[PDB]
Scaffold this motif. Structure first.
Motif, PDB file in Angstrom:
ATOM      1  N   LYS A  61       5.741   0.473   7.176  1.00 55.21           N
ATOM      2  CA  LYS A  61       4.662   1.299   7.706  1.00 55.21           C
ATOM      3  C   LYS A  61       4.482   2.552   6.865  1.00 55.21           C
ATOM      4  N   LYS A  64       3.004   2.013   3.552  1.00 52.73           N
ATOM      5  CA  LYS A  64       1.569   1.751   3.616  1.00 52.73           C
ATOM      6  C   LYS A  64       0.785   3.055   3.743  1.00 52.73           C
ATOM      7  N   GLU A  65       1.260   3.980   4.595  1.00 50.11           N
ATOM      8  CA  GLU A  65       0.561   5.236   4.839  1.00 50.11           C
ATOM      9  C   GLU A  65       0.725   6.229   3.690  1.00 50.11           C
ATOM     10  N   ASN A  68      -1.735   4.969   1.052  1.00 50.47           N
ATOM     11  CA  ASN A  68      -3.118   5.259   1.423  1.00 50.47           C
ATOM     12  C   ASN A  68      -3.449   6.734   1.262  1.00 50.47           C
ATOM     13  N   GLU A  69      -2.480   7.630   1.507  1.00 52.54           N
ATOM     14  CA  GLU A  69      -2.733   9.045   1.247  1.00 52.54           C
ATOM     15  C   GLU A  69      -2.790   9.327  -0.245  1.00 52.54           C
TER      16      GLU A  69
END
Lengths: 96, 90
Positions: A61, A64-65, A68-69
């Motif tokens: 998780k 992934k975040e 994306n940032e």
């Protein structure tokens, strides 16, 4: 160009970074900052996989975040730079 | 061979950088780094002439010293490489 998790590494190159050197210091330093920040955040996003105290679920998780940032930040820097007439290099698979 | 301003271009190539992935990692990493650092610096040295805020005297002085340094890097990179059995083209 559209930055994605798949193409990040192939666009955030030292070549593309070096193109920023033509902007005036006023515009150049903040763009160089977002660029190097996205890259540091991207290249670190998988480190929770190697941390034994994190579950596979949370490491995936977070990975992934964080990516994306970092993608968002690189998109910001590229978009700022293209308004100033900079055109970055795409990845040409047959060149590698 | 021994690296110079004129021969840097001919030696630091993708072909020659290709020959280095075969290396064992403890040797493979720093020599890829030095190599890659040399190339990037040899190239950046050309942007000195694009800076209108640089006097031509200053831009030429910096161009040489940057090239000179990139030559040092590629030399040892090649030293450190050939010591592990990698033939490069002359």
């Amino acid at each position: 160009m559209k930055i994605t998790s798949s193409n990040f590494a192939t666009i955030a190159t030292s070549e593309n970074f070096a193109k920023l050197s033509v902007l005036p210091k006023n515009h150049r330093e903040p763009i160089k900052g977002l660029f190097k920040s996205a890259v540091e955040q991207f290249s670190s996003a998988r480190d929770f996989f190697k941390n034994e105290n994190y579950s596979k679920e949370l490491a995936e998780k977070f990975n992934k975040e964080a990516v994306n940032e970092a993608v968002e930040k690189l998109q910001k820097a590229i978009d700022l730079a293209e308004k100033q007439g900079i055109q970055f290099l795409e990845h040409h698979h047959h060149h590698h």
